[PDB]
Design an enzyme around this catalytic site. Structure first.
Site, short mmCIF file in Angstrom:
data_model
loop_
_atom_site.label_atom_id
_atom_site.label_comp_id
_atom_site.label_asym_id
_atom_site.label_seq_id
_atom_site.Cartn_x
_atom_site.Cartn_y
_atom_site.Cartn_z
N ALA A 1 -7.88 -2.43 5.96
CA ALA A 1 -9.03 -2.07 5.22
C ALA A 1 -10.22 -1.86 5.92
O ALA A 1 -10.97 -0.84 6.07
CB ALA A 1 -9.11 -2.84 3.85
N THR B 1 0.90 -1.36 0.03
CA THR B 1 -0.10 0.05 -0.05
C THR B 1 0.90 1.27 -0.05
O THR B 1 1.53 1.28 0.76
CB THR B 1 -1.01 -0.01 1.27
OG1 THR B 1 -1.90 -1.03 1.13
CG2 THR B 1 -1.86 1.32 1.27
#
EC number: 3.4.25.1
Lengths: 241, 220, 236, 202, 233, 214, 238, 201, 213
Positions: free
Chosen positions: H49, H1
């Site tokens: 997430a 990420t």
């Protein structure tokens, strides 16, 4: 002078008038009787049909509170139903804790003490119902107990509660129930119920019948349709002279 | 620690050593290990010293309340029951090992009480790190219905065995004799050990210590 | 005198005394009017300013519950504050859980569930001791179109085409009944609301005496500015 | 510890050793492991001494109050049920294997095993404790139906003696209790009274 | 059944500024059996009358002079079961003090704690005030103490006082008989005489209960000792 | 219950035309020791439902108590509604999953057999709350030793008569006796049919040991 | 008087006045009729409009796929009770994977509503319910009251002017059992119409119909779905 | 990420990649890691997430309630403080969230870094995630407060692209948002393959 | 020790079309090296426009499907309308996050129709992180199925190939073929394949046998 408003207040005479008013509520309900013979207990209730719109068996006043214990009630039916729930809870907890069926005397004492707990405080109201507990076993025999709104529990050979309990008790006294069996007691119970009913004051009524004894293998159950019909026919014949 | 107790024909003899060690160093040379419970009931303690003191104080207080309420002499069984229920509810976390001895209307009674809450009613008991030496003395020499002097000698012998064979025990022997007519708290009963005589004289003189600041406050 | 009966005592006619008294309290509130048309819902309230020194902009008798739902209140406004806060929380909770806008009816139902949650015994500390003294008009636009609901302290909520609450709600309701037809436009609804408010208001009706708001399909809750208010009022 | 109970026609025989150890040290050599729960109901205890003593005291209390309330002699099954409820509810905190044996007017002589974990089973005879493993074959080969009270006492004494000779956690004296309708007869076998089995040499 | 008590006070202020319930509890006290306390130079005597209503009563079964600790004694005038409640509470408070400080509670400290309990019952919800007055004696630091605690929760230190029936006359008699430097025996005689002033009928060693507090502690007098003292009078 | 003390071994279940048959040996093992050799691990729930349990026997006794009380209460109501086998299976799944989610599991694997409304029911509930229905079932080592034989027979013959099902269950019990060190040669067979629940026992498998001479 | 304010105070005649006043609360509501055939249970509710410009208040509520109710009396109490009943039905479906039998639900209602009749500072629920259900025992009509008593009925009507409906149901109770769905609904509609003023008639605006049956999950018909049931009704006999 | 944000004269630039992995396995290439909290607040998704999505949705709920109660939009500092206070109650319970709260309030453009470990810092540029070191390298070289808007877009895209080039756990597409005074706009979403064709070729 | 989880295998796949959605699953329930049963579908009909497929720990799957059914009925009671697919996905996210510290070990895929009548697929992780996708695979064989769905549905890594819309018949063929390929290599995928097709006509069910080893 304001002494009759709470169960936590004694009148100057030493009376608790709220409990007496609850008893009056019982005295206005219809009659239920129980008879203890040598091999069982038989309950008969005169269930008044207030509306023809109702089904058969609506507002039944006979309960199974344990496999071996049945209950006949009089007074405020909602109070009676909550007390039947209490009795069921007591029986089930007794089986869970001690591992056998609760003796009828012990169940009567427990429920009577629960009832008495509602006669001491201004925060609650005494129950407006009285009831009979009936049981049979080989070890203990037949047993019939009666509990009133004050919480007094007594054993009986025959008992009546409701509007016409004195006339019903007079009819019961004429019975040699100590040597009788459940079969002929059912007829006698139906006859007494049909006698004490007042057709002018009350129009129609169903006859609720139940029994527990060696006939049912110590299981409280509704009296079967054949015996009930025979008992009703015998009672109707006894009405005619 | 060595604590012991016997039942003799007229009552109970309790005994203890008086050494309290912190680790492997002697902290207290004269520690009192025999605890008052009631005028007729006493208790020797081993294990965690704070736990022993607090538990015996609590039970003594509760028994005083009980005896004021009933107006009667406390029973040893009551002290035993209170102690064992309290110790069991704590699941061995209160580390009190007790020798509980008394004389009540039923006679002399002696109990051993373990930190997890188990008790034993016995004619002689030992407890602590020196308990096996004292027990050896008892199993060699105990007889039922001993006289008071015989019982005192036997308990002192058991405590002495603990003192001279267990590193965690030492100093003096303390006794407590309980009968229906008297209570003798003999402290010390024996002094088998003494500090060695000094062969010299350390230099300790006025003016030896240098002082930076000084402040004298006068008290009224 | 007032402590003889508990707050949860029925009258011999089957009414809770406290609920009836709260209903009576609402008759002392200022008049609010909601009109539901096919193009949207309009709400209009009399501010009822008592002194020239008071700032009329500080009176908020019409509030936004959500971008698609507004609420007019009558009676005791301080009581309405907690109900409105609950309505806002419920709409945001519904958005958080289901990622959609709550319908006007379900918001009104959630607010009405609070009306009778009062009592003295069998309650947590600080629980409501009495009913709310408010009447609410919820006006919103959901998938079913524009809707107007009325809620009262008894906890009854009803869908309404047009309704008046407050002090003059009877004469205003009679006027609404003659004025209102199903195919009414939103401009006609606003004009008729202002006409009836002018008729029933004790004071003269200007751009500062009233609040007016609309909810429309595609436009959020919109409180009319005073210039728009004067645009509408100029011809009445 | 070795505990044992045997049913005969009119009652039960219970037996135990008297050894309480802490590790390899014998802390009590004359322990009384046969505990009266009621006038005709006993428990034999194995496992943690604190746990079994606490549970037996609690069950004695509950059974006595229950018997007073019912105005009826307690059932052996009722005492076994109380023990079972306590041992099952606190199975993660207790180390207690119990034998509950006694006499009833309704049921006669009764033996119940409540092992660790809190299950309850009625048995013609039950054994328990650390020593009981050594006498499983002996009691399997020796027990027969219809033994009298004296035969049951001798059977229990022999089995306990064999276990005590083999198990380091058992020893001391044999405590026996015969429970029947007339009452409870307790005895202690010690010294030469304990059954003797010659060590095989050569 | 519902175990919730009332949460509002039953003792409130009257328009004239008085708490009438406490005055009525005091009336209950004033109707009680006479009690006398006298603090001598070397001890305190507490003497009360216990005239049973019948010979069927076992005199030895119940006691009105009670020990709180080994050094503190109690007597009361008023309602006996309230007294039992307060005796139990005082014993528990003395034990808690001993548990914290490992010395016996000073008499003044115990009086303060008991008076605090009585005040609590003058203010808390759903209760009436106690209907007793307590006389508390103790020996501390080589010194005798005598206190009186009232149903309101106020306590006073006394050299000699009387409670119960005819307590005004008893107080007058005490203040015209009491002097400092008095010894415990003479104080016992004076306390018995004060009881005799309000006593009706013959006073015997069973009609009265006497407790004494000195350096040796607090103890109830046996009926034989009381009989000896009565013979001396 | 993280540590089971006295445990039962495999329980077998098999549907047949007109009912269900369940088998379980009568052994309560204490670790490796065969401590209790006359305990029933099959209970009759009501006239239409029977239950067999593997694993901790005290937990099984607890479940038997709770279920028996529920059935008693429902019969007390006397209103013409009784728990179906499917309802019992659902309630058992919920109870096991609730205990698992509190990290205090009931250490049992249950087979529920039933016959209601002309339909057979066979259900499995493990201690994690995994529950399913199958025409044949086997817990524990039976899952590895009896289930393949039951599945093979059901493959070549989906619908079994009662006699065939009983014979098949006998053969599986014999295999379990041969190959499972925690099994015993004394078992019970419970059958639920239109007539109700019938529990037969003790029973023994006929064993062969001629390979000991090979 | 001194006996008519608290639900915990027995009157000297053996009555509780607060319970009777809650009964009056039920009697103030608009009429509703419930009846059953061998296979169907029907609730027909006459809705009332506060004003000419208001929608008629909802009277029939969903409880579960096999259970619906019609209410009289305090609407917020009815919503409380309906939420309780829905939660009980969901609990039954979660635990036993079966629909909760109707009579057991009615027993739970009676137990819940009896409790506030005995405790100080509580009040009875001021709502009467007609409960239409279908289960293994067939169709069921139940009536629940503020007194916590409940009745199993062949037919029933509660609300304002319900005695005329009850008389009509008395007359045609023998016919009800063999009626088909349309005929049963029409019987219910005639009984409901018997409670109307002379000027008022049954319209698609003031009639709501709930139906449950053997193969039919509980369904409510409000404005335009009511017209097929209204079509075919003979004019009021007068 | 890899997520990044920076303030500059014309507002806040927010950029992210779109890859979610589960170990070595790429679970998704189309994750939206820029959370549109409301029309005036943006957040970023780094860490868990679910944690970021859930707690920033809770933040969106609280911000909307704040606006309804106060008739003003919440400030960026106030919103980030709310989020930090919300997640501090769960410290040590295993929450993993690293996010940038971006907006434009009365104090101008606002950029805050908030993490589940309790950090909350204002700043001019931030990069969060496994590929954030590479993004930092490119962004710092290219960054100035006086960038033109198109130059800022190019800088953000280039930094995310280089991060995806070096970091195994970054890839997919680059999503680019611009927070301006009257709200944010979603600028672009460019696949890393197209970016590679534009940068290498 | 006690582990409150088990690996029960199974694969779920969903493909969103222009006017359809497909949710398919294998029907094998297994534990360890054993097979509990060969008839255990992982697809549950939620509404007439919405199906959910759940894989992982079977106890959690049963509990969660019951919780979702209850919540759908509660929503219908409270709002007088059925839940849309997107609302169901948002609610499922909240439900899964409510056990964030003792999670449901379930991989959920929702296939349905949106409010515009278009196919919608939502994929969830065990703690409720979710997104909308055109196609998705979860479970034991998800890493086997996903690259081929990328290649065939997404047309990834292919040049000079047109992006024709995915029709229902081609989607059905692709689902069947991909599950046969998975049954070849993944020991947990086998026995039978259940396919639910959601269109505006409703939900249609199909069963395709797979190899029994």
């Amino acid at each position: 002078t304001g002494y009759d408003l709470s169960a936590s207040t004694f009148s100057p005479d030493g009376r608790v008038f709220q409990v007496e008013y609850a008893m009056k509520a019982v005295e206005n309900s219809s009659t239920a009787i129980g008879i203890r013979c040598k091999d069982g207990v038989v309950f008969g209730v005169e269930k008044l049909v207030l509306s023809k719109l109702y089904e058969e068996g609506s507002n039944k006043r006979l309960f199974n509170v344990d496999r071996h214990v049945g209950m006949a009630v009089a007074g405020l039916l909602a109070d009676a139903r909550s007390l039947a729930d209490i009795a069921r809870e007591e029986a089930s907890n007794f089986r869970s804790n001690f591992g056998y069926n609760i003796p009828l005397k012990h169940l009567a004492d427990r429920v009577a003490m629960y009832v008495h707990a509602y006669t001491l405080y201004s925060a609650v109201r005494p129950f407006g119902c009285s009831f009979m507990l009936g049981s049979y076993s080989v070890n203990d025999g037949a047993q019939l107990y009666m509990i009133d709104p004050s919480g007094v529990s007594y054993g009986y050979w025959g008992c009546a509660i409701g509007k016409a309990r004195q006339a019903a008790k007079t009819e019961i006294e004429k019975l040699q129930m100590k040597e009788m069996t459940c079969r002929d007691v059912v007829k006698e119970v139906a006859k007494i119920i049909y006698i004490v009913h007042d057709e002018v004051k009350d129009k129609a009524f169903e006859l609720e019948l139940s029994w527990v004894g060696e006939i049912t293998n110590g299981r409280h159950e509704i009296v079967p349709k054949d015996v009930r019909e025979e008992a009703e026919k015998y009672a109707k014949e006894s009405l005619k002279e | 620690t060595t604590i012991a107790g016997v039942v003799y024909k007229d009552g109970i003899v309790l005994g203890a050593d008086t050494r309290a060690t912190e680790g492997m160093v002697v902290a207290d040379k004269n520690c009192s290990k025999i605890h008052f419970i009631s005028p007729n009931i006493y208790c020797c303690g081993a294990g965690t010293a704070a736990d022993t003191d607090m538990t015996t104080q609590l039970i003594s207080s509760n028994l005083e309340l009980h005896s004021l309420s009933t107006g009667r002499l406390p029973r040893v069984v009551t002290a035993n029951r209170m102690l064992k229920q309290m110790l069991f509810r704590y699941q061995g976390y209160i580390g009190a090992a007790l020798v509980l001895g008394g004389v009540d209307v039923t006679g002399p009674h002696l109990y051993s009480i373990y930190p997890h809450g188990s008790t034993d009613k016995l004619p002689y008991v030992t407890m602590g790190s020196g308990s096996l030496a004292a027990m050896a003395v008892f199993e060699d020499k105990f007889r039922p219905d001993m006289e008071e002097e015989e019982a005192k000698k036997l308990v002192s012998e058991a405590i002495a065995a603990g003192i001279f064979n267990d590193l965690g025990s030492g100093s003096n022997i303390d006794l407590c004799v309980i009968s229906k007519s008297k209570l003798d708290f003999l402290r010390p009963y024996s002094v088998p050990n003494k500090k060695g005589t000094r062969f010299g004289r350390y230099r300790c003189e006025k003016g030896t210590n240098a002082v930076l600041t000084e402040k004298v406050t006068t008290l009224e | 005198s007032e402590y003889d009966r508990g707050v949860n005592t029925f009258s011999p006619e089957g009414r809770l005394f406290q609920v009836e008294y709260a209903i009576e309290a609402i008759k002392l509130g200022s008049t609010a009017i909601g009109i539901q048309t096919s193009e949207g819902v309009c709400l209009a309230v009399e501010k009822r300013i008592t002194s020239p020194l008071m700032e009329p902009s500080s009176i908020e008798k019409i509030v936004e519950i959500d971008a698609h739902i507004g609420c007019a209140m009558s009676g005791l406004i301080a009581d309405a504050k907690t109900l409105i806060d609950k309505a806002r929380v419920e709409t945001q909770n519904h958005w958080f859980t289901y990622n959609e806008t709550m319908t006007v009816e379900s918001v009104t139902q959630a607010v009405s569930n609070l009306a009778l949650q009062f009592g003295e015994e069998d309650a947590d500390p600080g629980a409501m001791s009495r009913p709310f003294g408010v009447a609410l008009l919820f006006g919103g636009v959901d998938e079913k179109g524009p809707q107007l609901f009325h809620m009262d302290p008894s906890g009854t909520f009803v869908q309404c085409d047009a309704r008046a609450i407050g002090s003059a709600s009877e004469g205003a309701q009679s006027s609404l009944q003659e004025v209102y037809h199903k195919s009414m436009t939103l401009k006609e609804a606003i004009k008729s609301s202002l006409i009836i408010l002018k008729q029933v208001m004790e004071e003269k009706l200007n751009a500062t005496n009233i609040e007016l708001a609309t909810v429309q399909p595609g436009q959020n809750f919109h409180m009319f500015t005073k210039e728009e208010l004067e645009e509408v009022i100029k011809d009445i | 510890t070795t505990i044992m109970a045997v049913q005969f026609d009119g009652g039960v025989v219970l037996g135990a050793d008297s050894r309480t150890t802490t590790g390899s040290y014998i802390a009590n050599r004359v322990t009384d492991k046969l505990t009266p729960i009621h006038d005709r109901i006993f428990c034999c205890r194995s496992g943690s001494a604190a746990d079994t003593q606490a549970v037996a005291d609690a069950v004695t209390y509950q059974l006595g109050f229950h018997s007073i309330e019912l105005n009826e002699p307690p059932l052996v099954h009722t005492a076994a049920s109380l023990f079972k409820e306590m041992c099952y509810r606190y199975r993660e905190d207790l180390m207690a294997g119990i034998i509950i044996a006694g006499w009833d007017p309704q049921e006669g002589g009764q033996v119940y095993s409540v092992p660790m974990g809190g299950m309850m089973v009625r048995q013609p005879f039950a054994i328990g404790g650390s020593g009981s493993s050594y006498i499983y074959g002996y009691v399997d080969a020796t027990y027969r139906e219809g033994m009298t009270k004296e035969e049951c006492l001798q059977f229990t004494a022999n089995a306990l003696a064999l276990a005590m000779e083999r198990d380091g956690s058992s020893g001391g004296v044999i405590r026996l209790a015969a429970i029947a309708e007339p009452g409870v007869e307790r005895q202690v076998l010690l010294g030469d009274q304990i059954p003797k089995f010659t060590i095989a040499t050569l | 059944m519902a175990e919730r008590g009332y949460s509002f006070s039953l003792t409130t202020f009257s328009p004239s500024g008085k708490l009438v319930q406490i005055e009525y509890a005091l009336a209950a006290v004033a109707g009680g059996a006479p009690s006398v306390g006298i603090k001598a130079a070397n001890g305190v005597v507490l003497a009360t009358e216990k005239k049973q209503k019948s010979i069927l009563y076992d005199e030895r079964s119940v006691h009105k002079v009670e020990p709180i600790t080994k050094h503190i004694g109690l007597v009361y005038s008023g309602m006996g079961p309230d007294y039992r409640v307060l005796v139990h509470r005082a014993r528990k408070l003395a034990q808690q003090y001993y548990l914290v400080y490992q010395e016996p509670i000073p008499t003044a400290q115990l009086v303060q704690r008991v008076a605090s309990v009585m005040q609590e019952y003058t203010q808390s919800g759903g209760v009436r005030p106690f209907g007793v007055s307590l006389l508390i004696c103790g020996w501390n630091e080589g010194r005798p103490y005598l206190f009186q605690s009232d149903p309101s929760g106020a306590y006073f230190a006394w050299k000699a006082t009387a409670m119960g029936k005819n307590y005004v006359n008893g107080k007058t008699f005490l203040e015209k008989r009491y002097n400092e430097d008095l010894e415990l025996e003479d104080a016992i005689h004076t306390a018995i005489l004060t009881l005799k002033e309000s006593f009706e009928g013959q006073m015997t060693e069973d009609n009265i209960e006497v407790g004494i507090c000195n350096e040796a502690g607090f103890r109830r007098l046996t009926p034989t000792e009381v009989k000896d003292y009565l013979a001396a009078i | 219950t993280q540590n089971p003390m006295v445990t039962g071994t495999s329980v077998l279940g098999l549907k047949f035309e007109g009912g269900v048959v369940i088998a379980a040996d009568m052994l309560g093992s204490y670790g490796s020791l065969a401590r209790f050799r006359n305990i029933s691990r099959i209970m009759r729930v009501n006239n239409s439902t029977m239950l067999g349990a593997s694993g901790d026997y005290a937990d099984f006794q607890y479940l038997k108590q709770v279920l028996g009380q529920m059935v008693i209460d429902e019969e007390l109501l006397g209103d013409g509604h009784s728990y179906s086998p499917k309802a019992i299976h659902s309630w058992l799944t919920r109870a096991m999953y609730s205990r698992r989610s509190k990290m205090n599991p009931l250490w049992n694997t249950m087979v529920i057999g039933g016959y209601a409304d002309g339909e057979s029911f066979l259900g499995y509930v493990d201690m994690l709350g995994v529950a399913y229905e199958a025409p044949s079932l086997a817990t524990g080592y039976g899952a590895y030793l009896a289930q393949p034989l039951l599945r093979e027979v059901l493959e070549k013959q989906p619908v079994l008569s009662q006699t065939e099902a009983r014979e098949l269950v006998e053969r599986c019990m014999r295999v379990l006796y041969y190959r499972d060190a925690r099994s015993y040669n004394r078992f019970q067979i419970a059958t639920v049919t239109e007539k109700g629940v019938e529990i037969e026992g003790p029973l023994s498998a006929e064993t062969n040991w001629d390979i000991a001479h090979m | 008087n001194q006996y008519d304010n608290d639900v915990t105070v027995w009157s000297p005649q053996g009555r509780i006045h607060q319970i009777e006043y809650a009964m009056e609360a039920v009697k103030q509501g608009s009429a509703t009729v419930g009846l059953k055939s061998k296979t169907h249970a029907v609730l027909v509710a006459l809705k009332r409009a506060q004003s000419e410009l208001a929608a008629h208040q909802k009277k029939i509520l969903h409880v579960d796929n096999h259970i619906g109710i019609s209410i009289a009396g305090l609407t917020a109490d009815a919503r409380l009770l309906c939420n309780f009943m829905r939660q009980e039905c969901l609990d039954s479906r979660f635990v036993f994977d079966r629909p909760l039998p109707v009579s057991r639900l009615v027993s739970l209602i009676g137990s819940k509503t009896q409790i506030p009749t005995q405790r100080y500072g509580r009040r009875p629920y001021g709502v009467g319910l007609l409960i239409a259900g279908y289960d293994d025992m067939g169709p069921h009509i139940f009536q629940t009251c503020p007194s916590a008593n409940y009745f199993d009925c062949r037919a029933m009507s509660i609300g304002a002017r319900s005695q005329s409906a009850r008389t009509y149901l008395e007359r045609h109770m023998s016919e009800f059992m063999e009626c088909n769905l349309n005929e049963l609904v029409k019987h219910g509609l005639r009984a409901l119409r018997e409670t109307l003023p002379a000027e008022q008639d049954l319209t698609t605006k003031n009639v709501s119909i709930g139906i449950v049956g053997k193969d039919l999950e509980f369904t409510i018909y409000d404005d335009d779905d009511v017209s097929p049931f209204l079509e075919g009704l003979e004019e009021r006999p007068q | 990420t890899t997520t990044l944000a920076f303030k500059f004269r014309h507002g806040v630039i927010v950029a992210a990649d779109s890859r979610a992995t589960a170990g070595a396995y790429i679970a998704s290439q189309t994750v939206k890691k820029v959370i549109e909290i409301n029309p005036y607040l943006l957040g970023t998704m780094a860490g868990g997430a679910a944690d970021c999505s859930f707690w920033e949705r809770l933040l969106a709920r609280q911000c909307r309630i704040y606006e309804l109660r106060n008739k003003e939009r919440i400030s960026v500092a106030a919103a980030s403080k709310l989020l930090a206070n919300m997640v501090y109650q769960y410290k040590g319970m295993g929450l993993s969230m690293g996010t940038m709260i971006c907006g434009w309030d009365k104090r101008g453009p606002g950029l805050y870094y908030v993490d589940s470990e309790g950090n909350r810092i204002s700043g001019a540029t931030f990069s969060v995630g496994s590929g954030s070191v590479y993004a930092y390298g490119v962004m710092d070289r290219g960054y100035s407060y006086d960038l033109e808007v198109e130059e800022a877009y190019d800088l953000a895209r280039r930094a995310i692209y280089q991060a995806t080039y070096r970091d195994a756990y970054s890839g997919g597409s680059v999503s680019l948002y611009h927070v301006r005074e009257d709200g944010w706009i979603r600028v672009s979403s460019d696949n890393v393959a197209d970016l590679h064709d534009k940068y290498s070729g | 020790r006690f582990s409150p989880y088990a690996f029960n295998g199974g694969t779920v796949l969903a493909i969103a079309g222009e006017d359809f959605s497909i949710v398919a699953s294998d029907t094998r329930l297994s534990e360890g090296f054993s097979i509990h049963t060969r008839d255990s579908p992982k697809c549950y009909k939620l509404t007439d426009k919405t199906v959910i497929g759940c894989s992982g720990f079977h106890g959690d799957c049963l509990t969660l499907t019951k919780i979702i059914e209850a919540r759908l009925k509660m929503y219908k009671h409270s709002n007088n309308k059925a839940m849309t697919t997107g609302a169901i996905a948002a609610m499922l996210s909240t439900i899964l996050y409510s056990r964030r510290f003792f999670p449901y070990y379930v991989y959920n895929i929702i296939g349905g129709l949106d409010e515009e009548g278009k196919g919608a697929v939502y994929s969830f992780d065990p703690v409720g992180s979710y997104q909308r996708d055109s196609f998705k695979a979860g479970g034991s064989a998800s890493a086997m199925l996903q690259p081929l769905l990328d290649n065939q549905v997404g047309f990834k890594n292919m040049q000079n190939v047109e992006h024709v819309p995915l029709s229902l018949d081609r989607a059905m063929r692709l689902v069947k073929d991909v599950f046969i390929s998975a049954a070849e290599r993944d020991v947990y995928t086998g026995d039978a394949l259940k396919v639910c097709i959601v269109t505006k006509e409703g939900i249609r069910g199909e069963t395709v046998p797979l190899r029994k080893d």
